[PDB]
Paper text:
The covalent attachment of ubiquitin (Ub) or Ub chains (polyUb) to cellular proteins is one of the most versatile known post-translational modifications, with numerous signals being encoded by different types of Ub-Ub linkages. Recently, Ub phosphorylation at S65 has come to light as a novel and important component in the PINK1 (PTEN-induced novel kinase protein 1)-Parkin pathway. In its native conformation, parkin is autoinhibited, and phosphorylation of both parkin and Ub by PINK1 at a conserved S65 appears to be necessary for complete activation of parkin’s E3 ligase activity. In addition to S65, phosphorylation of Ub has been observed at several other residues, suggesting that phosphorylated Ub (pUb) may play significant roles within the Ub-signaling system.
We also present the first crystal structure of UbS65D, which reveals the structural effects of introducing a single negative charge at position 65 in Ub. The structure of UbS65D was resolved to 1.2 Å. With the flexible C-terminal tail included, the UbS65D and UbWT structures superimpose with a backbone RMSD of 0.56 Å for chain A of the two-chain asymmetric unit and 0.94 Å for chain B. Removing the flexible-tail residues R74, G75, and G76 decreases RMSD to 0.50 Å for chain A, and 0.69 Å for chain B. The backbone structures of UbS65D and UbWT are very similar, even in the loop containing S65. Elsewhere in the molecule, the greatest structural deviation is in the C-terminal tail, which is likely a result of the tail’s flexibility, as well as in the β1/β2 loop comprising residues T7 to G10. An examination of the polar contacts between Q62 and S/D65 showed noticeable differences in the backbone environment of Q62 in the mutant compared to UbWT. The side chain oxygen (Oδ2) of D65 in UbS65D is 0.44–0.47 Å closer to the backbone amide nitrogen of Q62 than the S65 oxygen in UbWT. At the same time, it is 0.94–0.95 Å farther from the backbone carbonyl oxygen of Q62. Furthermore, for all three Ub variants considered here (UbWT, UbS65D, and pUbnat) the crystal structures predict a polar/hydrogen-bond contact between the side chain oxygen of residue 65 and the backbone amide nitrogen of Q62, as well as a hydrogen bond between the backbone amide nitrogen of residue 65 and the carbonyl oxygen of Q62. However, the chemical shift differences between UbS65D and pUb are nonetheless very striking, suggesting that the phosphomimic does not fully reproduce the chemical environment of the pUbnat conformer in solution. Given the role of the protonation state of the phosphate in controlling the conformational equilibrium of pUb, the inability of aspartate and glutamate to adopt a (−2) charge on their side chain explains the observed structural and spectroscopic differences between phosphomimetic and phosphorylated Ub and suggests that phosphomimetic Ub is a poor structural model for pUb.
Author numbering: 1 to 74
Amino acid sequence: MQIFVKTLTGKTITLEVEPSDTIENVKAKIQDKEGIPPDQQRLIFAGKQLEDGRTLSDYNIQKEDTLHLVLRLR
Ligand SMILES: [Mg+2]
């Protein structure tokens, strides 16, 4: 399924994912597309800060949901 990850400027990063993909895996996909190291990425959905070891399904993320990406220096 596709999900969207919005950056601070409103850019959409579209990812192809499965419900059993982890947040670690999502950050790896973002690194591959955008070149941003996973350790610099913070993902948020429905007000929750998303933990690397949990899955999309653990957060009830569904097709075409919009996550937010916030970045940190390092
Ligand atoms: Mg896969």
